[PDB]
Symmetry: C3
Subunit: 215 residues, 3 copies
């Protein structure tokens, strides 16, 4: 039973950490909320999406100081995943939550990704075709609408040029990155984009850790 | 000098013994379905709502071929990510040599058709089907009622529109084809639940065919 | 610190080879130039792109004998990369330069690929949507226009049915093929297309080697 030691240790660790992370998520005080981010995005779903980004970042830094990256640590990073290609501006990211501005200037679409996190996107501009699993028809969502991609759900997404949205995700964030960079690894091979993503995520993690240390 | 190389010689011997075995089996096997049969059955219902067409096609298939089409309890729409496109399938029948399914997409997708060891026929029930054959510079658009025969060893570029639905029948060595149907699910989407669903429906169809053979 | 010798040697080798190849490319005598290919392509920017292909191949074989493959060694090879799919006709290829006719008859788009080479594409027909990195808006280019995808640059590309262009790339060509075949490896699994690409590249390399040997 010596060769079973590795497998038993792996099973024990994975189930001890499933239980640990699941109890942590059910007893942790979160910074942001899905209704909060969706409401803030709906407040500005009218004007030019750039002005919406500006006002949303201003209100976020006012209402949650020390939790949004500084303008020095902001950059649009490409995101290739599930067969679609867009760009993101990460405003906040922790081990359990993340907030970003996502969108595309080209017509793309693919797999939404099935991960251990609840994600909410409020469309600021463009169109969002969603095709839920097990169906034969898709629905199109317009600026002002908010789509909640639940945990374990998998849909087909499609966007139009100029489609932009504010996105908030809550769950176990690392387990999701495996999907967000798969195409960057096996399709685009844009390792510099991978580096940019890791860089901005590390900056958000260090910002959150510094804010925790100050308190 | 044959110790290093023993693995390579065993691999070559096995691959050629199994190419011979499989190609002799495919040339001496009585098949269940036919390309023209499925094409006619699909074209007969190409004018109705593709959902109603699906219903009537499943009924006629279970009527004319009892014991070879899955029961309604074992049917479910499984996402399919492959060649850069994304659609969904409903597997009606599948063995080691044949498969019948209802394929289509509710979003605008397109990519590589996939080159495999099987002849595949698709009859469009609704939507549009852009096909771009290899070595050409122009593409053709196929409409409901048309039937496309993707021959063995052929590779094309496919593109679909929202609401494109079709009945598809493939004949050949089915396992060697699944490698293409799940590549994006492995390296791009990582939707392992969809991988499990695919293995599930294929195993269910294989067990149904094995049970029908055992009863006979 | 004995096993740090391997890592230090690896870094030293990679930087000595970076310096070697980069100095070579900065001092090498090239056969073609981007303005030459771009002007020749713009002269024939029309609707009947096929006649443009024929006349361009004729002019290339006239002004540079022994550097363009013969009609026997020409074939349209599928190209899957970055999430898009097109087809190519390789006219010339070496270790530092390559000239081809690229295009698609279907609607595709994805990652342009970030490689160690400057690439120039002159659109003969169709439309070319380019989305530059770090921006939120995309530009649309039409037949006659020439786009220079610079070294280290990464953009999002999108094409329409019937989009065809003449492309010339200069740099370290092998390091680019890794991107050009990634989707063929992990997405399409079209090993025959991989063989065709390797075959036409080998034919071009042997043609250029024969021309060097004759001189
Ligand atoms: C986990 C993840 C999924 C994803 O997909 C694009 C967003 N939306 C998904 C659903 O609906 C359409 C668009 N991006 N992303 C990500 C990527 C990079 C990240 C970096 C730091 C923190 C979170 C980070 C999170
Ligand atoms: C082998 C294969 C190719 C494919 O591609 C989508 C269909 N068409 C292809 C050509 O034209 C456009 C659409 N699905 N598929 C498959 C996927 C899962 C399967 C599961 C069980 C049995 C056969 C199974 C077969
Ligand atoms: C390196 C590379 C990139 C590429 O991408 C498509 C062209 N364009 C790129 C930028 O803008 C849009 C379209 N093809 N390709 C290639 C593929 C095969 C090759 C074979 C031999 C020599 C060079 C060879 C070069
Ligand atoms: Au930004
Ligand atoms: Au931003
Ligand atoms: Au079904
Ligand atoms: Au069905
Ligand atoms: Au050619
Ligand atoms: Au050609």
């Amino acid at each position: 039973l010596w060769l079973g030691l590795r497998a038993v240790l792996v099973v024990a660790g994975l189930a001890v950490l499933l239980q640990l992370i699941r109890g942590w998520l059910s007893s942790k005080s979160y910074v942001f909320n899905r209704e909060e981010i969706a409401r803030l995005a709906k407040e500005h779903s009218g004007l030019d999406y750039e002005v919406a980004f500006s006002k949303i970042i201003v209100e976020l830094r006012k209402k949650h100081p020390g939790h949004i990256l500084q303008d020095e640590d902001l950059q649009w990073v490409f995101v290739n995943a599930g067969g679609w290609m867009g760009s993101m501006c990460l405003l906040h990211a922790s081990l359990t939550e993340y907030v970003l501005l996502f969108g595309t200037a080209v017509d793309t679409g693919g797999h939404s990704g099935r991960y251990w996190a609840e994600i909410s996107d409020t469309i600021l501009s463009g169109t969002f075709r969603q095709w839920k699993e097990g169906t034969t028809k898709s629905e199109i969502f317009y600026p002002g609408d908010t789509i909640v991609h639940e945990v374990g759900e998998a849909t087909s997404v499609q966007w139009s040029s100029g489609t932009w949205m504010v996105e908030y995700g809550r769950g176990f964030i690392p387990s999701t990155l495996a999907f967000a960079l798969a195409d960057t690894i096996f399709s685009t091979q844009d390792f510099l984009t991978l580096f940019y993503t890791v860089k901005v995520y590390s900056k958000a993690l260090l910002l959150e850790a510094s804010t925790h240390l100050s308190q």
